[PDB]
Amino acid sequence: SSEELVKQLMEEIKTATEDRKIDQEVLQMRLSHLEQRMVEDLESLSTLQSELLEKIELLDYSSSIKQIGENLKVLDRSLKPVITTVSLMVEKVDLLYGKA
Amino acid sequence: LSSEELVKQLMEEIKTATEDRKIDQEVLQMRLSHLEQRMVEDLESLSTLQSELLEKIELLDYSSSIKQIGENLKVLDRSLKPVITTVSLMVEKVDLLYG
Amino acid sequence: TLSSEELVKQLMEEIKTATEDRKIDQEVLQMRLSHLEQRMVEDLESLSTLQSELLEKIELLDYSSSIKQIGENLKVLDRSLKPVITTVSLMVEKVDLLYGK
Amino acid sequence: SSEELVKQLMEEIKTATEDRKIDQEVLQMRLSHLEQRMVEDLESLSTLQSELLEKIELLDYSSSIKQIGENLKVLDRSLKPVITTVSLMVEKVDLLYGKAAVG
């Protein structure tokens, strides 16, 4: 019963090492689940992030707005000569109208 | 200092250490599950925010307003120098008729 | 030179030093997960903030009205010019006919 | 078969201890893989977000759109007299055209 206490105990360590074997199964099951959920979800986020990027570059109107701006400055330029050419016609027409 | 008493001491040392290791394992299982639940909670939030960025950014669509302005700017261009030039011609033609 | 009783006692001091060291080793594996959770919590918090700060910035970059106005003002300036263009248009038809004779 | 039992038990404990030592090393190894994957993925999201913060600044036309609004108002104000002036002048051309047209 000292030699039967060693008997029982060698069965406990056999028992406990079987338990530990399953305990380590469950652990791998939770680890893998986290790793797989991390790529499903940290990945999913990256898609949308990049889908947003697409639309940000599809709503770049810097070129259209630079151009509108520049076309408006051409008109505003041609105002100078226009007023000049009109003012010379006014006196010309004023002269014919006084000497008709 | 018996043998049957000293095997029993070692029996309870091992029994304890086995109880300890089990707990350690259940602690680790809980911490892994907690981390995964927290990560999911916090990503679902970010994931929602990013969908409302996808919509909200359509506020920055001006494609149509911008085409209409490009065209009205052509209309203005035809409304100025080409008109004056025909007027200057016209005044030239009247001027001769009075000669 | 190995009494059964003496091998047991040696096994108990052995096991005792292994149960202490097993303890420290497990506390480190535990705190590895606490450290990673925190790291993840902090970085996702920062992400979330920027996301909100981006949302506020999109609202500060809506010049949709300010563009519609320029769109309209410009329609108004063009409409303001049709009457004079018509007048010139008619006078030119009349003058060119007389000049061509 | 007292000392030879202890010596057998000791061997069972040795194989149990060393199996555990390895399971710990295997766990430490998956944890390092987890730590490195998590950090690499979070650094990517943080990279891609700060690239987002920059691209969106390209849609800040405020400076341009003020200048457009400004340059238009000028033109619109600067044209009001030019319409008036050409309208009076074209009426006078009319009155001159009438006489030239009968004579």
Residue numbers in the entry:
A (entry chain A): 72 to 171
B (entry chain B): 71 to 169
C (entry chain C): 70 to 170
D (entry chain D): 72 to 174
From the paper:
It self-associates in oligomers through a central oligomerisation domain (POD) and bridges the RdRp and the nucleocapsid. Here, we used X-ray diffusion and diffraction experiments to provide a complete structural analysis of BoDV-1 P. We observed that P possesses a modular architecture, consisting of a central oligomerisation domain (POD) surrounded by two disordered regions, similar to other Mononegavirales Ps. Using X-ray diffusion and diffraction experiments, we revealed that BoDV-1 P adopts a long coiled-coil α-helical structure split into two parts by an original β-strand twist motif, which is highly conserved across the members of whole Orthobornavirus genus and may regulate viral replication.
Crystals were obtained for the POD of munia bornavirus 1 (MuBV-1; 77% sequence identity with BoDV-1) and Gaboon viper virus 1 (GaVV-1; 41 and 43% sequence identity with BoDV-1 and MuBV-1, respectively). The structure of MuBV-1 POD was solved by molecular replacement using BoDV-1 POD as a starting model, whereas GaVV-1 POD was obtained de novo using Se-Met derivative crystals. For both MuBV-1 and GaVV-1, the asymmetric units contained a tetrameric POD, whereas the tetramer for BoDV-1 could be obtained after applying the inherent symmetry operations of the tetragonal space group. Globally, the only differences concern the relative spatial position of the two coiled-coils, due to the inherent flexibility induced by such a break and the crystal packing. The three X-ray structures fit perfectly with the SAXS data.
